Amino acid sequence: XTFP
Amino acid sequence: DGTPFPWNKIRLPEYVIPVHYDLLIHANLTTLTFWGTTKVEITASQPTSTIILHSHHLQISRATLRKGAGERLSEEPLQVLEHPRQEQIALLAPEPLLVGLPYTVVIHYAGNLSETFHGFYKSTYRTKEGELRILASTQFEPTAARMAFPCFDEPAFKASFSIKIRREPRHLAISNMPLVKSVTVAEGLIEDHFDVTVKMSTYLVAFIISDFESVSKITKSGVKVSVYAVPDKINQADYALDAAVTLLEFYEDYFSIPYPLPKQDLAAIPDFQSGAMENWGLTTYRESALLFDAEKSSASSKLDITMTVAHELAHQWFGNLVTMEWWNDLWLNEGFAKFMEFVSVSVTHPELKVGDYFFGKCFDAMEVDALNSSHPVSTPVENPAQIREMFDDVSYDKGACILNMLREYLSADAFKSGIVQYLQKHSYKNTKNEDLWDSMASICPTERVDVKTMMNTWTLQRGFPLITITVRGRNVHMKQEHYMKGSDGAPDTGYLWHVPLTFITSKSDMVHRFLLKTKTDVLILPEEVEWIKFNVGMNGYYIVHYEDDGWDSLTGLLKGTHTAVSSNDRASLINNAFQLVSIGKLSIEKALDLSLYLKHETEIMPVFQGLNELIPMYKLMEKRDMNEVETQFKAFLIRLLRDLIDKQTWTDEGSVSERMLRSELLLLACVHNYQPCVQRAEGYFRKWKESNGNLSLPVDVTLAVFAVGAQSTEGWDFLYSKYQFSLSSTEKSQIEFALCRTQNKEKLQWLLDESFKGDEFPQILTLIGRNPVGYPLAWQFLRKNWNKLVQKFELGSSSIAHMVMGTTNQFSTRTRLEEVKGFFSSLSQLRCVQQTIETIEENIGWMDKNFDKIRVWLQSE
Ligand SMILES: *[C@@H]1O[C@H](CO)[C@@H](O[C@@H]2O[C@H](CO)[C@@H](O[C@@H]3O[C@H](CO)[C@@H](O)[C@H](O[C@H]4O[C@H](CO)[C@@H](O)[C@H](O)[C@@H]4O)[C@@H]3O)[C@H](O)[C@H]2NC(C)=O)[C@H](O)[C@H]1NC(C)=O
Ligand SMILES: *[C@@H]1O[C@H](CO)[C@@H](O[C@@H]2O[C@H](CO)[C@@H](O)[C@H](O)[C@H]2NC(C)=O)[C@H](O)[C@H]1NC(C)=O
Ligand SMILES: [Zn+2]
């Protein structure tokens, strides 16, 4: 992670 | 007797702190049970005969309290009370503890491996032979360490950890620290003693018991970067490994701080549920997010890997070495890593072109923030588990955006120095939100900035500001106002920000800062200027509006040169132009006149903004009665994009951004009968059909050639006979969208009827509904078969919502709004339908406002  | 649980707070008492845990885990991957003994060295700040710690779904076998050693060693039993609702437990001692004197709690417990992918949880995978094999892993964020072993499970109780894992010879253990020694405990057992960690938080403790292969490299710092995965796919970890090494070196240099651990392990867990987690020394990832296959698993996979690895390693310093005092500051964490993804990859892997992705993320963040239903980045969490679901990744993307605006206002090296000083003053400790700002302010530019107060205005307030610039001679007047996009009602908030404005003018090429702390302010320039442009580089988290004739001078700047400002600058101009057209501050004329510049634009970011704002207008016109204006607008769009479409190559070369743009432009040019593209696509399609698919087709052009191949029944029947056999996503969904772009309504109804019985149909209903010839077909089929449909797809997920909203999202006329309301009344269903009816009403409003203007505009030219 989600990065997003 | 009944004992009252001696504690009624959500946080643990502050006056009993641990120093060092000694964890012995013994898990059984075939029984799916694991028992454990944990030793916690503790110190009491105050006198007390009770210890409150966390434990969840663990039957405490027995707990004891020891003090001293040698001839003085004493051991007492401890009474155990359990408050499950709070996930807590109390240990009651007969005589109170002595202030500052060291004690050692020993807890013997057992539990079951969690199926819920939280805590100490079981995972499974099938080898290339069908042999199903199990492994055990951990996911402690935010507060699931309570499930693997009792402890003070709050991120401000940092301790050291001495972990020991009992496993079979078949398996292989890994944890945060390196393995020091393995000792054969019993017949089939082996104890892996892992090195003692540094003072850290509980939720970053990790361990894995698996049968994984690995591949390793060493950086200049001697750090051993290894990538673990299942034996079959381990030849797919070279890329992630090289990326981890490069980025580890980058972070060591950027932070001016050596990586604080001896090694670093990236594990590719099967069916990972969180995407990735930054366990100190043992970062875990979904398989797809870490491993890379020769046959491109995706055109964007090899970029997701880099951004994932950059984020997870950024956390090794920012977040694990320095960790939040309490989850109410987690936002900052996820902000920084997310922003670091940009800073680091932009340097380490320049070929990926991460800038486009990042700034698009900022655009989305603002789009959400501009609505009434938005929250400030910084919110007081009273319970981590309850309000960890409320927080959304868009909040974290804001966080990164704000941090970028800040890095650009302050010197880039000033920001870097502030980070270095922050991480050095606070290593192995916990920090509040304001500590980073305080570290940012004490930096000297090589007027004090007062970062703290400014940043509070962006973190504690929902939404962002609209900035209006008026220019009277050398006097530049600046206005700020909460940019609220909701056109329902007239609610107004007195929100003010410290806007770190940045501008450039036609005279000086240098960037000028100005910190607007009030509603109104005036800036005096040395001499009049041809033009002025604020928010240089699109970095600040605001939008500018130029009063009087500013937009004119900027539109002329773009149409005349356009390289006068940066690619991002042009993208900003387009975005802001149309967003202001929305809130009624800019004429739709002005916006289209602006967009006219797009014939010269080569970069991806402004072209995509222009597409994002122009396509929907044409899409709205498709459902419209008369096409005499729709055709003229499609002609305007293709005249705009004619040079750029021609420039492109029919390959898969370039970055993810460029490949995506290539696909979009070619499919667009071909769906609107652009002679060159249609003929080239028909050529590729003929050659493809001759070999029956044996010939390789560039995956970026396959959509165009298939959309043209479904035109005549000749290619259409072929594509249908081909999709029947295929199961692959890229292989099948592309052909699916191809067959949905047909001018033959017979094939359309055929596809509808056949797909209803499970030939897929969820997406097919929408992809057919948004077809210019047969859009009423898909909306009329959903009314007569609605009962059976809802039965088949129950409720939830995105099928129901993607096919109910997809069939009614682009409705232009009010005659159709009546037909929506009269339908849904005769029947999160209500939420989906309410969103749909609201968006349809907005559609009719936008039509009423702008259609008659756009018609006249399409004539002058
Ligand atoms: C989890 O629980 C399972 C049981 O539910 C447990 O699996 C069993 O472990 C034992 C011990 O390793 C296994 O028995 C061994 O099998 C191997 C392979 O066939 C043999 O080589 C072993 O014989 C050696 O040892 C004998 C006694 O020392 C000697 O007499 C002999 O000469 C050999 O040197 C031994 O029989 C057993 O097969 C498995 N499976 C089952 C169904 O019992 C597992 O160990 C547990 N794991 C953990 C981590 O607790
Ligand atoms: C793991 O789950 C099992 C049930 O699936 C638990 O087994 C129960 O244990 C209690 C007390 O020991 C018995 O009274 C029940 O009869 C057991 N049920 C079954 C189906 O065996 C087990 O206790 C759980 N693990 C732990 C550590 O509590
Ligand atoms: Zn993160």
Residue numbers in the entry:
A (entry chain D): 2 to 5
B (entry chain A): 43 to 488, 513 to 825, 831 to 898, 903 to 936
Paper text:
To begin to address how domain closure is coupled to catalysis, and to dissect structural features related to substrate binding from those related to the open-closed transition, we crystallized ERAP1 bound to the decamer phosphinic inhibitor, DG014, and determined the three-dimensional structure by X-ray crystallography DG014 shares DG013’s phosphinic group and N-terminal residues but is seven amino-acid residues longer, and similarly inhibits ERAP1 with high potency. The crystal structure shows that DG014 binds as expected with the phosphinic group at the active site, but with only the first five residues sufficiently structured to allow confident modeling. A complex of ERAP1 bound to the long peptidomimetic inhibitor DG014 trapped crystallographically in the open conformation exhibited some of the conformational attributes previously observed in closed-state structures, in particular ordering of helix 4a, suggesting that these changes were coupled to substrate binding. Helix 4a is in an intermediate state in the open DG014 structure relative to closed-form structures, with a shift required to adopt the configuration present in the closed conformer. We suggest that the region between helices 4 and 5 (residues 426–433) acts as a sensor for substrate binding, ordering to form helix 4a in the presence of sufficiently long peptide-like substrates, and providing a site by which domain closure can be coupled to active-site reorganizations required for catalysis.
The endoplasmic-reticulum aminopeptidase ERAP1 processes antigenic peptides for loading on MHC-I proteins and recognition by CD8 T cells as they survey the body for infection and malignancy. ERAP1 is a member of the M1 aminopeptidase family, which is found in all domains of life and plays numerous functional roles. These proteins contain a thermolysin-like domain10 (domain II), which holds the active site. The M1 aminopeptidase family has a conserved HEAT-motif-repeat domain (domain IV) forming a bowl-shaped C-terminal structure.
